[PDB]
Amino acid sequence: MFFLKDLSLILTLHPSYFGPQMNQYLREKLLTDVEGTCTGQFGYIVTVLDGMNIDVGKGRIIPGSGSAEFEVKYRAVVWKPFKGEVVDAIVSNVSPIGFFADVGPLNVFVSTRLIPDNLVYNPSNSPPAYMSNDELITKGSKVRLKVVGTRTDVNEIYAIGSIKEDFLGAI
């Protein structure tokens, strides 16, 4: 789920870059650096509210190196899942051992054992998809799916859900 997060990023600037439009160069550096990164403690940083109007303040020269440090404080929006929270999605992949659903920036895959047993897979249908009597899961469908697991890998994270519970699955 998306949270508005106050966060900072300390930076280092070479003396060669010490020109008259420096602060805007650092703003562009921040926008390139942070727009897309994952952190295990926050989630996923999709955008930044009021990107061009971040205040870099006054940087301090590090004694011995001559490079500037900036505590660029700003308020942004981050998206983090939590186990036991219900999140909607749309299926991306399909496979006999389960399917993938894109959640926020990520993609969630649900395993075969965690699926209502009235759902039956089909490798021969056109289009290929899970079926049932009165239940359908095809590409482009919506899935109100619960998260029951999230491993934190620094670059890309993955969440494994479960549609075995009531009020969940095809919608």
């Binding site: 070479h14 003396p15 060669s16 010490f18 020109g19 006054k58 301090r60 020269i61 004694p63 001559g66």
Partner: protein, 84 residues
């Protein structure tokens, strides 16, 4: 929060010896790191002497943050402190 407004700044208006020494060292390191030079470079190649010329012409772009014993501080640009 801890910064002091430019009106109630009660420190000396004069650059001290330690501030001058450290400012010159830092500027010399900066110019020696291929930083742009604000003064007109005529003859000298030593980064420290270039830094001295810039300091005399009030063209060194640095700020001294003078910490008080209670943790608060005052900010003075080098160009507004008076150099002897």
């Amino acid at each position: 929060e801890l910064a002091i407004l430019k009106e109630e700044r009660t420190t000396t208006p004069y650059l001290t010896k330690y501030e001058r020494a450290r400012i010159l060292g830092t500027r010399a390191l900066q110019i020696s790191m291929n930083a742009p030079v604000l003064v007109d470079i005529e003859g000298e190649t030593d980064p420290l002497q270039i830094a001295m010329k810039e300091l005399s012409q009030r063209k060194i772009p640095l700020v001294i943050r003078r910490y008080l014993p209670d943790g608060s501080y005052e900010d003075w640009g080098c160009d507004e402190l008076i150099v002897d």
